[PDB]
Every structure is written in structure tokens, then in C-alpha cells.
Amino acid sequence: AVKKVGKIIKKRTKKFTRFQSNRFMRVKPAWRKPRGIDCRVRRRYKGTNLMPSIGYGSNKKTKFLLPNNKYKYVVKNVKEMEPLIMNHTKYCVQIAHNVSSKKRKQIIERAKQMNVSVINAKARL
């Protein structure tokens, strides 16, 4: 159903799973549009899988915000996070997956001095 926390509204939370992916294991769950005569999902029979459509789209004013109510930016070194000193209230940072611990300590320490929040500041400790 509809989920609403603050001013952010999500029209649906469940995923769209591929038709017949629960019955055959060679069929992966990622959504593919059904083509083919006599399908019962392409023809919108009641009681089966639903199709995704543009109607479920999100409000333009709140489209990429996290529950933090900020946008996400991914950084790879200390210098890449220079632009965040001017807009430190609309953005939060996340550290890339393949940076070492030594680099991560420096990134976290600078992010604290800039008053910007870090999403995942507990990895590799």
C-alpha cells in the first residue's frame, strides 16, 4: 500500500517479480515484460502478477531524498569532497567500497570538521 513518513510519500514498497519465477529456477526474478499470445499477465487477468507503469512515479520535490531527508554523494578520497562545504545541509556522504582503512579515517575526520554526516562510518573498524 501507500507509505508516508513525513512529507515523503511512496506509492508502493513491494517489488515487481518476473512471471513464473517462483515455479522454474532457470527464470530469474528480475522484471521482464511479457510478450506472447495467451499470457494472462499481458492481458491483465485478475489474480496474477501486476505490471509496472509510469503511474507509480514519485513526487518531483522528494524524488531522491533518503530518510535522512538529504541527497547522497559518494566520494573516493579527501579532495573529492571539497564542493560539500557550500551545501552541507542538503547532502550526505557515503564512502566508496574499495578505499582502505587509512584513507577512510582521514575522510571521516574531515567530514566531521565540515559538519557533514556520513552514512556508513563504521566499516572496517
Binding site: 521482464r32 515484460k33 510478450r35 506472447g36
Partner: protein, 147 residues
């Protein structure tokens, strides 16, 4: 570039754009120009009407260098001269230019257009037409035959 080809848009569709009921088969109407005059007749008649049959005399060993002949009209005849040179002749009145068109690659002078009034000009060539030669004479010029 294969990046931009149409077939990539049909890549998840069954029939690749050719149809469920009528397939894509191999030569379902003949090969090349096969069925003309039998079952391709309408196309042949409305797009290439005079196609069938023969007309005219034979010429057994042609040798095209015997009749080669490029032409020029009298319009482009004052334009072979530089503009500053064209200016000088229109000013002075007791001199006229003598132009040899064979040195420029033309063989026959042809008679379309209008020469300037009262501006004599002398033209050398291999062949002339009647109207061209009349127009050259009218403004006070002269034609000369060369070989």
C-alpha cells in the same frame, strides 16, 4: 556502426519485426528480375514503361573520339574575360576583343541568351549555329572558322 542499427530495438521481441503469419522466407517471389512480364508486370509498367522490345539501327564499331564535341552559349562568352579587362573594352570604342574558345575546351558555339548592345566581339571556333552567328553579327561582330 552496429551501435545504431534498427535490429537492436527488436532484440526481445519474437519475430524480429517480420510478422507472425507471413514469415521471412527466402526468395518467395523469384530471383533478381525474375517475374517481370508475368507476375511483376504492374511494377514494370508503372515505373519503367518502355522497357521491353528494341528500336533503331546498329553501329558496329563506335570510336567515340570522332564525334566528341563540347558546347558553349553566348551568355558565358563575355564571362571568360577578367572583370577589369571587361571594364576597359566597355570604355574604349575603337577596339574589340578576339576570343578563341578552342583554347578553353569548347568546340561549338551555341546561341542562347542576350549579348550586350553595341559592343562588338570577334569569336573563333570550329562550329557555329545559325542563331548564335546571327546574334554575333547583329551587335557588330564577326565569326571565324578554325581547324
Amino acid at each position: 556502426a552496429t551501435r545504431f542499427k534498427k535490429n537492436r530495438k527488436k532484440r526481445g521481441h519474437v519475430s524480429a519485426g517480420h510478422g507472425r503469419v507471413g514469415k521471412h522466407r527466402k526468395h518467395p517471389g523469384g530471383r533478381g528480375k525474375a517475374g517481370g512480364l508475368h507476375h511483376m508486370r504492374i511494377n514494370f509498367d508503372k515505373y519503367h514503361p518502355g522497357y521491353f522490345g528494341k528500336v533503331g539501327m546498329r553501329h558496329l564499331n563506335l570510336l567515340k573520339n570522332r564525334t566528341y564535341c563540347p558546347t558553349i552559349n553566348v551568355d558565358k562568352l563575355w564571362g571568360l574575360l577578367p572583370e577589369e579587362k571587361k571594364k576597359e573594352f566597355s570604355e574604349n570604342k575603337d577596339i574589340a576583343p578576339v576570343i578563341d574558345v578552342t583554347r578553353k575546351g569548347y568546340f561549338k558555339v551555341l546561341g542562347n541568351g542576350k549579348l550586350k548592345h553595341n559592343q562588338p566581339i570577334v569569336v573563333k571556333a570550329r562550329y557555329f549555329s545559325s542563331v548564335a552567328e546571327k546574334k554575333i553579327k547583329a551587335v557588330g561582330g564577326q565569326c571565324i572558322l578554325v581547324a
